[PDB]
Design an enzyme around this catalytic site. Sequence first.
Site, PDB file in Angstrom:
ATOM      1  N   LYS A 155       0.830  -1.204   0.000  1.00  0.00           N
ATOM      2  CA  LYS A 155       0.000   0.000   0.000  1.00  0.00           C
ATOM      3  C   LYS A 155       0.866   1.256   0.000  1.00  0.00           C
ATOM      4  CE  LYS A 155      -2.471   2.604   3.557  1.00  0.00           C
ATOM      5  NZ  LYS A 155      -1.288   3.500   3.671  1.00  0.00           N
ATOM      6  N   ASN A 156       1.934   1.217   0.779  1.00  0.00           N
ATOM      7  CA  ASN A 156       2.794   2.384   0.911  1.00  0.00           C
ATOM      8  C   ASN A 156       3.906   2.498  -0.145  1.00  0.00           C
ATOM      9  OD1 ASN A 156       1.213   3.523   2.886  1.00  0.00           O
ATOM     10  ND2 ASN A 156       2.559   2.967   4.609  1.00  0.00           N
ATOM     11  N   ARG A 188      -3.978  12.295   4.308  1.00  0.00           N
ATOM     12  CA  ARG A 188      -2.900  13.297   4.301  1.00  0.00           C
ATOM     13  C   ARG A 188      -1.736  12.975   3.346  1.00  0.00           C
ATOM     14  NH1 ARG A 188      -2.688  15.021   9.141  1.00  0.00           N
ATOM     15  NH2 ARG A 188      -0.564  15.893   9.281  1.00  0.00           N
ATOM     16  N   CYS A 192      -3.883  14.737  13.354  1.00  0.00           N
ATOM     17  CA  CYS A 192      -4.110  13.308  13.216  1.00  0.00           C
ATOM     18  C   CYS A 192      -4.270  12.726  14.595  1.00  0.00           C
ATOM     19  CB  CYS A 192      -2.971  12.614  12.487  1.00  0.00           C
ATOM     20  SG  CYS A 192      -3.421  11.020  11.781  1.00  0.00           S
ATOM     21  N   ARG A 241       2.094  15.690  13.284  1.00  0.00           N
ATOM     22  CA  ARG A 241       2.516  15.282  11.940  1.00  0.00           C
ATOM     23  C   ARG A 241       2.755  16.446  10.972  1.00  0.00           C
ATOM     24  NH1 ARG A 241       1.416  10.119   8.929  1.00  0.00           N
ATOM     25  NH2 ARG A 241      -0.726   9.630   9.551  1.00  0.00           N
ATOM     26  N   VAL A 251       4.632  19.046   8.243  1.00  0.00           N
ATOM     27  CA  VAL A 251       5.233  18.737   6.952  1.00  0.00           C
ATOM     28  C   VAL A 251       6.307  19.750   6.578  1.00  0.00           C
ATOM     29  CG1 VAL A 251       3.258  17.448   6.079  1.00  0.00           C
ATOM     30  CG2 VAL A 251       3.392  19.910   5.704  1.00  0.00           C
ATOM     31  N   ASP A 252       6.878  20.379   7.603  1.00  0.00           N
ATOM     32  CA  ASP A 252       7.929  21.392   7.446  1.00  0.00           C
ATOM     33  C   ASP A 252       9.092  20.923   6.569  1.00  0.00           C
ATOM     34  OD1 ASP A 252       8.159  19.656   9.929  1.00  0.00           O
ATOM     35  OD2 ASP A 252      10.164  20.550  10.013  1.00  0.00           O
ATOM     36  N   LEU A 253       9.437  19.637   6.680  1.00  0.00           N
ATOM     37  CA  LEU A 253      10.543  19.095   5.906  1.00  0.00           C
ATOM     38  C   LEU A 253      10.212  19.020   4.413  1.00  0.00           C
ATOM     39  CD1 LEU A 253      11.821  16.172   8.220  1.00  0.00           C
ATOM     40  CD2 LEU A 253      12.804  18.408   7.935  1.00  0.00           C
ATOM     41  N   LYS A 274      15.600  15.648  10.275  1.00  0.00           N
ATOM     42  CA  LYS A 274      15.292  14.349  10.818  1.00  0.00           C
ATOM     43  C   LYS A 274      14.879  13.361   9.741  1.00  0.00           C
ATOM     44  CE  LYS A 274      11.316  16.563  13.105  1.00  0.00           C
ATOM     45  NZ  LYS A 274      10.596  16.489  14.420  1.00  0.00           N
ATOM     46  N   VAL A 275      14.717  12.105  10.131  1.00  0.00           N
ATOM     47  CA  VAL A 275      14.416  11.074   9.161  1.00  0.00           C
ATOM     48  C   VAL A 275      12.926  11.080   8.860  1.00  0.00           C
ATOM     49  CG1 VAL A 275      14.257   8.614   8.789  1.00  0.00           C
ATOM     50  CG2 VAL A 275      16.375   9.636   9.678  1.00  0.00           C
ATOM     51  N   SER A 276      12.587  11.208   7.578  1.00  0.00           N
ATOM     52  CA  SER A 276      11.190  11.271   7.172  1.00  0.00           C
ATOM     53  C   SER A 276      10.927  10.567   5.863  1.00  0.00           C
ATOM     54  CB  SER A 276      10.738  12.717   7.033  1.00  0.00           C
ATOM     55  OG  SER A 276       9.612  12.824   6.166  1.00  0.00           O
ATOM     56  N   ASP A 309       4.393   0.663  12.208  1.00  0.00           N
ATOM     57  CA  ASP A 309       3.208   0.043  11.631  1.00  0.00           C
ATOM     58  C   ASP A 309       3.002  -1.396  12.105  1.00  0.00           C
ATOM     59  OD1 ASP A 309       2.368   2.309  10.303  1.00  0.00           O
ATOM     60  OD2 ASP A 309       3.073   1.655   8.323  1.00  0.00           O
ATOM     61  N   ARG A 369      -9.090   1.029   4.500  1.00  0.00           N
ATOM     62  CA  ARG A 369      -8.069   1.868   3.878  1.00  0.00           C
ATOM     63  C   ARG A 369      -6.717   1.155   3.799  1.00  0.00           C
ATOM     64  NH1 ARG A 369      -7.330   7.310   6.975  1.00  0.00           N
ATOM     65  NH2 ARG A 369      -5.751   7.569   5.314  1.00  0.00           N
TER      66      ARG A 369
HETATM   67  C1  LIG Z   1       0.516   5.514   8.889  1.00  0.00           C
HETATM   68  C2  LIG Z   1       0.987   5.369   7.461  1.00  0.00           C
HETATM   69  O1  LIG Z   1       2.315   4.876   7.449  1.00  0.00           O
HETATM   70  C3  LIG Z   1       3.269   5.891   7.517  1.00  0.00           C
HETATM   71  C4  LIG Z   1       4.400   5.366   8.312  1.00  0.00           C
HETATM   72  O2  LIG Z   1       3.861   5.137   9.579  1.00  0.00           O
HETATM   73  C5  LIG Z   1       5.415   6.457   8.380  1.00  0.00           C
HETATM   74  C6  LIG Z   1       6.539   5.906   9.186  1.00  0.00           C
HETATM   75  O3  LIG Z   1       6.540   4.548   8.831  1.00  0.00           O
HETATM   76  O4  LIG Z   1       5.893   6.753   7.102  1.00  0.00           O
HETATM   77  C7  LIG Z   1       4.879   7.248   6.284  1.00  0.00           C
HETATM   78  O5  LIG Z   1       4.319   8.271   6.999  1.00  0.00           O
HETATM   79  P1  LIG Z   1       5.011   9.626   6.995  1.00  0.00           P
HETATM   80  O6  LIG Z   1       5.563   9.914   5.702  1.00  0.00           O
HETATM   81  O7  LIG Z   1       3.998  10.520   7.492  1.00  0.00           O
HETATM   82  O8  LIG Z   1       6.145   9.401   8.073  1.00  0.00           O
HETATM   83  P2  LIG Z   1       7.462  10.211   8.294  1.00  0.00           P
HETATM   84  O9  LIG Z   1       7.413  11.450   7.590  1.00  0.00           O
HETATM   85  O10 LIG Z   1       8.595   9.335   8.168  1.00  0.00           O
HETATM   86  O11 LIG Z   1       7.390  10.552   9.796  1.00  0.00           O
HETATM   87  C8  LIG Z   1       8.512  11.184  10.365  1.00  0.00           C
HETATM   88  C9  LIG Z   1       8.312  11.699  11.771  1.00  0.00           C
HETATM   89  O12 LIG Z   1       8.859  12.986  11.745  1.00  0.00           O
HETATM   90  C10 LIG Z   1       7.853  13.970  11.819  1.00  0.00           C
HETATM   91  N1  LIG Z   1       7.871  14.831  10.662  1.00  0.00           N
HETATM   92  C11 LIG Z   1       7.543  14.420   9.469  1.00  0.00           C
HETATM   93  C12 LIG Z   1       7.589  15.321   8.429  1.00  0.00           C
HETATM   94  C13 LIG Z   1       7.961  16.625   8.644  1.00  0.00           C
HETATM   95  O13 LIG Z   1       8.004  17.442   7.734  1.00  0.00           O
HETATM   96  N2  LIG Z   1       8.282  17.016   9.857  1.00  0.00           N
HETATM   97  C14 LIG Z   1       8.243  16.136  10.845  1.00  0.00           C
HETATM   98  O14 LIG Z   1       8.551  16.492  11.965  1.00  0.00           O
HETATM   99  C15 LIG Z   1       6.528  13.278  11.923  1.00  0.00           C
HETATM  100  O15 LIG Z   1       5.852  13.735  13.072  1.00  0.00           O
HETATM  101  C16 LIG Z   1       6.868  11.853  12.166  1.00  0.00           C
HETATM  102  O16 LIG Z   1       6.707  11.658  13.556  1.00  0.00           O
HETATM  103  C17 LIG Z   1       3.826   6.184   6.157  1.00  0.00           C
HETATM  104  N3  LIG Z   1       2.694   6.740   5.492  1.00  0.00           N
HETATM  105  C18 LIG Z   1       2.540   6.479   4.223  1.00  0.00           C
HETATM  106  C19 LIG Z   1       1.350   7.023   3.532  1.00  0.00           C
HETATM  107  O17 LIG Z   1       3.342   5.833   3.641  1.00  0.00           O
HETATM  108  C20 LIG Z   1       0.052   4.501   6.667  1.00  0.00           C
HETATM  109  O18 LIG Z   1       0.209   3.291   6.669  1.00  0.00           O
HETATM  110  O19 LIG Z   1      -0.857   4.987   5.997  1.00  0.00           O
HETATM  111  O1  LIG Z   2      -4.929  11.924   8.432  1.00  0.00           O
HETATM  112  P1  LIG Z   2      -5.195  10.724   7.555  1.00  0.00           P
HETATM  113  O2  LIG Z   2      -3.921   9.931   7.387  1.00  0.00           O
HETATM  114  O3  LIG Z   2      -6.247   9.853   8.199  1.00  0.00           O
END
Ligand SMILES: C=C(O[C@H]1[C@H](O)[C@@H](CO)O[C@H](OP(=O)(O)OP(=O)(O)OC[C@H]2O[C@@H](n3ccc(=O)[nH]c3=O)[C@H](O)[C@@H]2O)[C@@H]1NC(C)=O)C(=O)O
Ligand SMILES: O=[P-]([O-])[O-]
Length: 418
Positions: free
Chosen positions: A22-23, A91, A115, A120, A122-124, A160-162, A305, A397
């Site tokens: 899915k991801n 999102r 959320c 969560r 998205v500054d990065l 940070k790692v994102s 996850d 979902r």
């Molecule tokens: C919950 C989703 O899985 C998530 C999965 O949990 C996370 C980590 O594995 O990586 C994706 O999320 P994501 O992209 O939001 O996660 P990341 O960005 O890595 O999260 C990084 C961490 O740093 C923080 N973060 C992220 C972005 C940013 O700009 N700034 C920031 O501070 C977030 O709060 C988070 O705590 C997957 N989402 C999708 C759609 O791929 C899902 O299954 O739908």
């Molecule tokens: O905020 P959306 O991932 O349910």
Amino acid sequence: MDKFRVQGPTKLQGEVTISGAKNAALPILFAALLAEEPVEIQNVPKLKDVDTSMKLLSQLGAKVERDGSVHIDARDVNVFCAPYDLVKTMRASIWALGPLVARFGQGQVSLPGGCTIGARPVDLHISGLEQLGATIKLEEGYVKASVDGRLKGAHIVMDKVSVGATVTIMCAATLAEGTTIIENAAREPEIVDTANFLITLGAKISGQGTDRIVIEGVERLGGGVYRVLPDRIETGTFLVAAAISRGKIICRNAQPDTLDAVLAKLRDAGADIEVGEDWISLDMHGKRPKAVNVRTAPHPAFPTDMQAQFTLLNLVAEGTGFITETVFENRFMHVPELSRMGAHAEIESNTVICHGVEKLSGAQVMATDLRASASLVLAGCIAEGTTVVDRIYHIDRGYERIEDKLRALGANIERVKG
Ligand SMILES: C=C(O[C@H]1[C@H](O)[C@@H](CO)O[C@H](OP(=O)(O)OP(=O)(O)OC[C@H]2O[C@@H](n3ccc(=O)[nH]c3=O)[C@H](O)[C@@H]2O)[C@@H]1NC(C)=O)C(=O)O
Ligand SMILES: O=[P-]([O-])[O-]
């Protein structure tokens, strides 16, 4: 409001075929906005999150249809905004921003809000794009990005790692002038799959799966055909399903090198595991699992996850085990629900402390989490009596037809329309 009615206890055993990630599907579908000839993505799971993606693509002007594979024609894309009504329901829509600005020089995406699992921001994503030469402003809740001409390759060191931002920048850079280098990149398998899809379209990327990604801009990207890798989270979920029911299972269409941390932890819980090149087997030999200690972190460490599922394992295991969450520090709503079913746990800050019980009791519980709530369904399968899992549209979902796969493993499960 669909619900799952589940009858237990029941021992899950047999085999299951793993669906596409899915991801990986999601980022790839959005990366397709870069393509100037038509692309076919194979092995895509039938999930609501894919539906929502397609709906957005189409809305942007792309031509989209699907079954087993999804078909995308992004030549006639002519609208450049992901509206509030869509973003609020998923999102990950934010992923449209990058490709739109890279290819058409403009993009408007709704800024995501709160959320239930935690902070969560998205500054990065935004910062990465600015660093690539984009101008970004926020009006009426929309992050509006623009660039005169095309983006410029840059040396970007990530605070940070994102996973999300790594994908955003990687994708945008494929159509920039010169070389981009992403330092401290996320190494998730899905980011590798996304890079390999991009290369297939004619992009130049190296270092995917490592902390340093190098992108050499090209002037345009084409079309093609690409198959999405297997879903490690679905794989883990079923392996855990077997491990808690004292069962045995074979997962088909798997990619074992994707689950090192999870498999290691399952062995510590007492499971007997073998791997082929595209299968995983797990046997409990009638044994109840042993408590384990887990700490979530970015790949290739143990994944958030999978955290709720392992919480469930611990809650029916022999002994005491703790689970610490360092990625989403408030992702514990499953815990109080499992408590309605007789589980014994406490939450101290961002660690859950579990004291395993012998068996759980059926009760009415509420799903709230795309992936985490699958653990409520799993609990239902092994609990004593009848469990009703309310509000399973969340689960829809995240998993392709989870009741069919569970039933084929011996589960007594039914989808009702109360
Ligand atoms: C919950 C989703 O899985 C998530 C999965 O949990 C996370 C980590 O594995 O990586 C994706 O999320 P994501 O992209 O939001 O996660 P990341 O960005 O890595 O999260 C990084 C961490 O740093 C923080 N973060 C992220 C972005 C940013 O700009 N700034 C920031 O501070 C977030 O709060 C988070 O705590 C997957 N989402 C999708 C759609 O791929 C899902 O299954 O739908
Ligand atoms: O905020 P959306 O991932 O349910």
